[PDB]
Amino acid sequence: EYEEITLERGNSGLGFSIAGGTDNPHIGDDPSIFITKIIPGGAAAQDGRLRVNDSILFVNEVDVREVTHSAAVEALKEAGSIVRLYVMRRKPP
C-alpha cells in the first residue's frame, strides 16, 4: 500500500515537517518517518495539497522509514530540485 507522489522541491528549504524515526520516535511501536505538519507556502503546499501523515517509504531510491529521522530529512533535501516521494500506509491515526 504505497502511493507515488512527485513534488517540486524548493531551493534551500522544501516545505514539509517530519516527525520522528528510530533515534527520536513519536511512537516506539512503528519506527517510520512521518510528516506531522505541512510548511505553509513551501513545496508541499504549492505543488499539491496532501495530508501530512504520508509516511515516507522511499524518497528517490533511499530506503527510509526504519532509519534515523536525520537520514530521511537529508534524503528529502538530497532529492535536489525534485522530491520523488513514495509513501506506505502502516499506522494512519
Binding site: 528549504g13 517530519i18 516527525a19 520516535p25 513519536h26 506531522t36 510548511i39 529521522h69 530529512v73
Partner: peptide, 6 residues
Amino acid sequence: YKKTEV
C-alpha cells in the same frame, strides 16, 4: 521526540 522542519 522532535519534529525536524524540511
